Write a protein that binds this DNA or RNA. Structure first.
Ligand code: SAM
Lengths: 98, 107, 94, 328, 87, 98, 82, 106, 94
DNA sequence: GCAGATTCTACCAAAAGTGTATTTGGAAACTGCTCCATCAAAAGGCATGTTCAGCTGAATTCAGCTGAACATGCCTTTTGATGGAGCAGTTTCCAAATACACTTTTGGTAGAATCTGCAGGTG
DNA sequence: CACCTGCAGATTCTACCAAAAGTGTATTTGGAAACTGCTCCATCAAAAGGCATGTTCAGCTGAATTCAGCTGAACATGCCTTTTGATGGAGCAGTTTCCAAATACACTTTTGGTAGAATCTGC
């Protein structure tokens, strides 16, 4: 049985997703997370569907860009595997936790 | 009669821009040349982004500019990338870019 | 209530640069956000500028300085020429 | 007294006074002495063997004695090579093209002797045509290699500065003629002294050059519209001359005959040229454009890579516009 | 209006494969097992912050519906300007 | 001949400079640098004295905070020595390079 | 002995900045890198300050021109007016 | 006549805040309570920082607040530090802080 | 020409909070910068709030929402109570 | 001991507060109508959970060599004193910006109709 | 990846028009322009406090080596998101009424800022 070596498919996935633009988090699950969080802030809120899509476009752009920085932090440490400490260093330098 | 846009040789609406400047509460007064100059700049920046986005669309064998083309245009252009450095273009995706050390083999 | 957008003007310019190229509604929405965004940025820089100089008037001179403060190198140069040209022409026509 | 470095061919030796004249804070007579000696060592195997004698690599720029023991070793070594050259070994040929490291050095030597005060040329306020010319060696080499020069061609440098680009092209490639025109009086005046000095120094080193003229004129003028059209290789330096000037130069590349190539540091039209329904004023209706590779080792003072852009006159662009308009 | 199901633990709807995909778009080739929970925690903070401001705009306007514009303005305030939704 | 080990004095200096607030670049050289840069944007300018001082207070606070991020990057790579690649990583994540 | 102005930002001055920044050991290459970074910082802030100077038709850069420049660059400074 | 500040029980100048709001081109109109509310907010924030700054002067055995004390008060306070996260207090210095890995191995 | 600042009011507050504590010139200038900075942020946020809602008036309500958007948690809560208290007190006075 | 903060007298345009009359933004009131929440049903795109082992991260060891500490010596910076380059305060005056009444042009947009780029599947 | 079919999204017209935008007198005034006084900036001299440079070696960086076990790849299974539709109605948003509160002067009062003189005090 044929097997690509570890990393081969990962690289293929990188090329595929960097070529496309569709959102990567499932839509309904993201909508529920938005509603759950909003509900804890204020009860009985309604949402325009484009308000939830706007939050999703912004959340995914934010996460993709944070993973780029995280990746640079792992590579800086001579690793190719991102780890919680890379995300933390990236957020600290960005002033998100500084 | 003639529009202030025609007198200035512009496609963008000088009248509209003058109005928006007044309603925006930017200053007590707005001179006549302000909206002309501003409409001209907005028109120029939009010409620049559409020039590059239409080229990205052509590069991708498409006739219709979509958000991805606006993003490729902006991100592949040093100055537009900086001007929009803190802006997210919805459905824009990102530029293909794989860090070298992550590629296989050697040499 | 009528809601304005720069759409028809963006379209006119699109036709000048790329005659046979169209634009999707989502891209046009992005272009409308872009124009509003830069308008606000330039207008706000102009406002502060005038206030800093105790002037109650925003003239093309404040727009020009705001443009220089806001735009990167080559874009500022070209924007400046286009605006200057538009005003000189405007003032010659009346 | 003085320090003398004698010619390998027995042209006329180069004399450097003592005390050493300084041209600027980065170029002095001493550093020219050291550079000559390295490059002559590289051309003549035997010379370098004779530079092995006595003390070597303990000379320093300033100190009469330290530079005189090097000069004196060189002058003896030249004599020996001249006696040898009467024999089985023959003179350094003047049909041999120069190598890139050697060519760079010949222009550097020449430069210092024409321009006795380059800092003054470097004071310019950005955004005007007075902005002093000259380009890095690497860029000019990129042009020479990629855009072939043939002996059915004519080379012209609009905004040549001290004319070192023209000179470099003329020693390295042949053409019918090679020219430099420069507007601002000070760098152009120097351009004449460069043309003469360059010719003296090419013989001195025993290497081949073509035929060239550096001319003092104004490249932002009516006469030069015709010069450009009957020319087929235009190098033009611009970027920091202002949009106003970019328009007027563009108009003059418009006058150019089909086939003509323009090498510039200015993208006169987009790379990917698309039609406009008002390209009756835009230069791109008559040229294919592609951007040449940025070269690192030629950074500015903002630390930006300098590019050149290859534009080729092709009227097919124009022919297609017109046909689309004839339709319907 | 009768009932309305309780919302809980929806952060788990941000699955391991979705996070892997987002990291791939971000150019990531290998991922430690601890990254998934860390990313959920970071996304929750991001969302709480933007949603808090967006809802603040909603309440100020005395509306009960969070609009795309309330989100656009909230994003802009946070230095995350978003184009494409009226903003 | 007494001799402190490598690092002992470095640590001593960190403690000393983190306790004080005086500027650490000498004034005149900073002023010359400022004037030279400004001359490229507009010739024959004068500077109020407070203008140069504000530029120095801002420039020093910028470099000191950048050194803090640089230090976290070197430490992230298991080093205690800052290197150019650490400053570059920090600037890229801050978005000054990005 | 001459001296390039940016070189006036000396190794010792840079080390002190680094110390206040908590830095214990420094690579020799750090000094030039720092100078380059500082020049870019000053070019960006001074360019804007001078833009405000010129707009005001002045020949003197004021603290306020600098404060406004720093503020628009997201580097708000307290203590010099504004 | 009683000053608007006294009526509001404030030390900060309501009248001046109203004037600054009007001429700042923030809106065509400015209601009566706006400058009062805003002045009160500015007063409160001022009291908060001076309160912590004064405490820092005290801990340092000083009776006069200098920039250093304002910096220590702000950077040691989670909320003030975030409010002033992009602000530089001239002559403030930084908080004493050495990364643990840099300390000698006692 | 008059140069206004918040110096005298900052000083009155200092005396309420630390009666026997003084403040240097540089520190006071920092406090003046602080007050002007917060004033501008709050005012700008209130300005945007009214424009977003197409209102010509900045009232205590826009100031309140601006405060909740700009200040961190506890600071916002106390600022809001202080502001509400002052407008109450003010409104109840011949 | 002293640079810088504090106390005090005197001057006054600038503000700020009070009084009067007019103007108006936007709240309540009623309501048209978009679009949000929600239930339904179907199904396949994906999430989940597992197996297996490639190769990565983490540990350990070690030697070259780069930076830290430091002693040695002078040149660039800091400090204090002095003509003017202009930053500002004042006065004059018009080009140009509100304010206001019509008159005309135009960008939206509601509704129905036909077009056309390319998503999506295939080989 | 070029070719080819079905379709949602897009560019194609008709008619209505209030909101724009523009054309035309009257009235108002912001700020360019010129002259000028008062700062405070540039520059020079000299009293003053680091910095540049070469030597020595401690200990750090990074190379080489090893391996436990994490994490990627592939796979089986089937859940739940997605898609297509419909519907009640919450509530957003349009329209008219109309006062509480804001703008708009005009006038009286107080007040914060500035300038100069001189004593006081934290550090
Ligand atoms: C950037 S400099 C050229 C430097 C040199 N050509 C090089 O490549 O290094 C441009 C030159 O263009 C010249 N120039 C501008 N307009 C010109 C004109 N109309 N005729 C001749 N020379 C002109 C200027 O005087 C200026 O020296």
């Amino acid at each position: 049985p044929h097997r690509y070596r570890p990393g081969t498919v990962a690289l293929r996935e990188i090329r595929r997703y960097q070529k496309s633009t569709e959102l990567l988090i499932r839509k309904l699950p993201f909508q529920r997370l938005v509603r759950e969080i909003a509900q804890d802030f204020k009860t009985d809120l309604r949402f325009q569907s484009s308000a939830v899509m706007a939050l999703q476009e912004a959340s995914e752009a934010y996460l993709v860009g944070l993973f780029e920085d995280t990746n640079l932090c792992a590579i800086h440490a001579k690793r190719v595997t991102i780890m919680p400490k890379d995300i933390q260093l990236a957020r600290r330098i960005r002033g998100e936790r500084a | 009669a003639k529009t202030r846009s025609s007198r200035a040789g512009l496609q963008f609406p000088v009248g509209r821009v003058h109005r928006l400047l007044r309603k925006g509460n930017y200053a007590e007064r707005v001179g006549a040349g302000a909206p002309v100059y501003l409409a001209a700049v907005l028109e120029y920046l939009t010409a620049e982004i559409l020039e590059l986005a239409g080229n990205a669309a052509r590069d991708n064998k498409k006739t219709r500019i979509i958000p991805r083309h606006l993003q490729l245009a902006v991100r592949n252009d040093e100055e537009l990338n900086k001007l929009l450095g803190r802006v997210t273009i919805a459905q824009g995706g990102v530029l293909p870019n794989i860090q070298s050390v992550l590629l296989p083999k050697k040499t | 209530t009528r809601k304005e957008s720069y759409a028809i003007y963006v379209y006119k310019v699109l036709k000048q640069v790329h005659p046979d190229t169209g634009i999707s509604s989502k891209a046009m929405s992005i272009m409308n956000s872009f124009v509003n965004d830069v308008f606000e940025r330039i207008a706000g820089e102009a406002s502060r500028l005038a206030h800093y100089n105790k002037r109650s008037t925003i003239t093309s001179r404040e727009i020009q300085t705001a443009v220089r403060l806001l735009l990167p190198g080559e874009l500022a140069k070209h924007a400046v020429s286009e605006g200057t040209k538009a005003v000189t022409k405007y003032t010659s026509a009346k | 007294l003085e320090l003398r470095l004698k010619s390998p061919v027995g042209a006329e030796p180069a004399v450097y006074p003592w005390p050493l004249p300084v041209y600027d804070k980065h170029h002095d007579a001493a550093h020219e002495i050291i550079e000559t000696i390295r490059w002559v060592c590289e051309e003549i195997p035997d010379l370098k063997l004779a530079m092995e004698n006595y003390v070597l690599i303990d000379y320093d720029t300033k100190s009469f004695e330290s530079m005189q023991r090097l000069c004196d070793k060189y002058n003896r070594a030249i004599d020996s090579i001249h006696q040898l050259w009467k024999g089985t070994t023959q003179p350094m040929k003047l049909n041999t093209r120069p190598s890139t490291g050697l060519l760079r050095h010949i222009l550097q030597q020449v430069y210092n002797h024409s321009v006795t005060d380059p800092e003054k040329l470097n004071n310019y306020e950005p955004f005007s045509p007075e902005v002093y010319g000259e380009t890095s060696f690497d860029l000019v080499a990129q042009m020479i290699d990629e855009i072939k020069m043939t002996d059915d061609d004519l080379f012209v440098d609009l905004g040549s500065g001290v004319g070192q680009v023209v000179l470099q092209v003329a020693a390295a490639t042949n053409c019918k003629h090679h020219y430099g025109v420069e507007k601002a009086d000070i760098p152009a005046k120097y351009a004449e002294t460069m043309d003469r000095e360059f010719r003296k120094w090419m013989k001195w080193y025993g290497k081949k050059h073509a035929e060239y003229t550096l001319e003092r004129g104004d490249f932002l003028s009516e006469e030069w519209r015709e010069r450009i059209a009957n020319t087929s290789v235009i190098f033009v330096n611009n970027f920091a001359f202002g949009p106003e000037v970019d328009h007027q130069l563009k108009e003059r590349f418009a006058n150019m005959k089909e086939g003509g190539r323009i090498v510039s540091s200015k993208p006169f039209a987009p790379l990917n040229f698309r039609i406009n329904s008002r390209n009756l004023s835009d230069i791109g209706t008559i040229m294919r454009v592609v951007e040449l590779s940025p070269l690192k080792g030629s950074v500015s003072w903002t630390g930006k890579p300098v590019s050149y852009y290859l534009h080729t006159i092709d009227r097919t662009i124009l022919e297609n516009y017109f046909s689309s308009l004839k339709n319907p | 209006k009768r009932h309305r199901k309780v919302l809980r633990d929806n952060i788990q709807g941000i699955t391991k494969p979705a996070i892997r995909r987002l990291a791939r778009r971000g150019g990531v080739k290998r991922i430690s097992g601890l990254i998934y929970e860390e990313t959920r925690g970071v996304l929750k903070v991001f969302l709480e912050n933007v949603i808090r401001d967006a809802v603040t705009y909603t309440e100020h306007a005395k509306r009960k519906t969070v609009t795309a514009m309330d989100v656009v303005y909230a994003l802009k305030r946070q230095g995350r300007t978003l184009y494409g939704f009226g903003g």
